[PDB]
Design a protein around this ligand. Structure first.
Ligand SMILES: *[C@H](O)[C@H](C[C@@H]1CCNC1=O)NC(=O)[C@H](CC(C)C)NC(=O)OC1CC2(CCN(C(=O)OC(C)(C)C)CC2)C1
Lengths: 297, 298
């Protein structure tokens, strides 16, 4: 089961940011609201926005920030990469303990999808190897954030900016740097070739075993390098030794050597699933990390 | 299409732990009442075939430890309603949302906030199967975790977790303590009915496919509801109810495809199969998205 982190600590930070006829979401932490800088653009502006130029021509009072029914007065503004930072005259008493992190491709996070500053849904995503995310984001979702929670600490890793023509999504870290080769401009952008997150597929196969499901297992084995030759042929990421290490706990728990599960996955890549399904899926799933699997088994 | 859960914060603000002796589970604190599974009053050997009424007569208010985090909530009354305990406490929860208690129908989906020792671990979307089980992620200590939907700002609580079945699926009650399906809160081996496919949700999925321009499977014909139901059961599909036809109304209006015409298309898919084709990029028909879910994501 794909499980998201409880979203309450993040819900308490979501606000609405408006500039002109453009409205999206902001993240209110202490006395600063973070949001995508393209809020300052109009229709025309978005095709090729000179953001430093557009920003210098804005005043604080052109930014309407609403926390529910309350307006928050903007007393200062600055831009860090693709994120706008609006200083407000009120501190958010619901600010959690937090940090800003930049996540690695293959890592997972929860997304709190919001519209008009109001939380609407929560779901689990992975940072794809090509630095897209297979999100569910509609008009007005920009400024929705992604996060992980460790203890009481929220690690914010993603802020939402755009959708690509293939229907996947792109955004930045909370420092405003995009994941991937994308730009916050209204143009058709393609991503690099995506690949499948191999260490996560292996984790999920282990999960299917832990769940008493093992039709895909076999007696064969493989070396790491020979597995990786086949993996790359099928646009799977190569498996590193640290990935093998990371899979130990699941390996121990099932008594199945990592490289034995690699030999099972190799057979699936070459033969297909021949109708059969694994944990309900006709497709090999690659958006559970080993941690995700462990913490839920 | 993703399994998307509701934001969990309004429910997180209601979770507590309830302990009797060394047995700890979760409870739901709304206004000045805490709701939890009655089997908190059981020891190990009580769970085999508990006499709940005789177990409760021995208990007093001061035997219940209710905690929000580490802070004790004093219990000032107790009673049993079906399979839930209602513990009256001396503090009204200041985080109580607007809420309702609803009893859902099979096929309906809801979010579960999986909790341990009163602390949330994760949130996910569940569907009530036609055999009144859910495929959860519930570990020891998860009992009392709740399922819910959020409409406007109103939380509709529909599920409270009580047990696991020998096949690994899960069973529980509504917030009035009435089990979904033919299960009892005893630690005995109980079997669920053979499960079936949630027809109304498949139809919702086919409407979703049409909304996104994937409509090769629409045929020129229609059917009666009875004829469809008799065929559907031969494929281990749930028969449709009138309420099912009704909740497909909005998607039928959005697409202009009458419900019974879509039923005719599905019947053809069942009888002829997919013939190598895909719908929304899958050869499998999805049955855990409700008509409401589809609309929320389109
Ligand atoms: C901010 O809320 C918004 C979020 C977008 C809106 C729709 N889904 C989203 O994630 N972001 C923006 O509007 C971007 C602003 C720029 C200044 C960066 N622009 C875009 O995201 O580009 C448009 C979305 C787009 C529309 C058409 N098309 C499409 O229909 O795709 C399929 C897969 C549905 C056919 C591609 C995506 C271009």
């Amino acid at each position: 089961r794909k499980m998201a982190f409880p979203s309450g600590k993040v819900e308490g930070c979501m606000v609405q940011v408006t500039c002109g006829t453009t409205t999206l979401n902001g993240l209110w932490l202490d006395d600063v609201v973070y949001c995508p800088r393209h809020v300052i653009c109009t229709s025309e502006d978005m095709l090729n926005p000179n953001y430093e130029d557009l920003l210098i021509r804005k005043s604080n009072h052109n930014f309407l920030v609403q926390a529910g029914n309350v307006q928050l007065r903007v007393i200062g503004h600055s831009m860090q990469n693709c994120v706008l930072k609006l200083k407000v005259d009120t501190a958010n008493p619901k600010t959690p303990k937090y940090k800003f992190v930049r996540i690695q491709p293959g890592q997972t996070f929860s997304v709190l999808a919001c519209y008009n500053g109001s939380p609407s849904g929560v779901y689990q995503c992975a940072m794809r190897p090509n630095f897209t995310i297979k999100g569910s984001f509609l008009n007005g979702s920009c400024g929705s954030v992604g996060f992980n929670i460790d203890y009481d600490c929220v690690s914010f890793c993603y802020m939402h900016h755009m959708e690509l023509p293939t229907g996947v999504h792109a955004g930045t870290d909370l420092e405003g740097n995009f994941y991937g080769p994308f730009v916050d401009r209204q143009t058709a952008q393609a991503a690099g070739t995506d690949t499948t997150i191999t260490v996560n597929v292996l984790a999920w196969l282990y999960a299917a075993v832990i769940n008493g499901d093992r039709w895909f297992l076999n007696r064969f084995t493989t070396t790491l390098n020979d597995f990786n030759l086949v993996a790359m042929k099928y646009n799977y990421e190569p498996l590193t030794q640290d990935h093998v290490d990371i899979l130990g706990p699941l390996s121990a728990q099932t008594g199945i050597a990592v490289l034995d599960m690699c030999a099972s996955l190799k057979e699936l890549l070459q033969n297909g699933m021949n109708g059969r399904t694994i944990l309900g899926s006709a497709l090999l799933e690659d958006e559970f990390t080993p941690f995700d699997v462990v913490r839920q088994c």
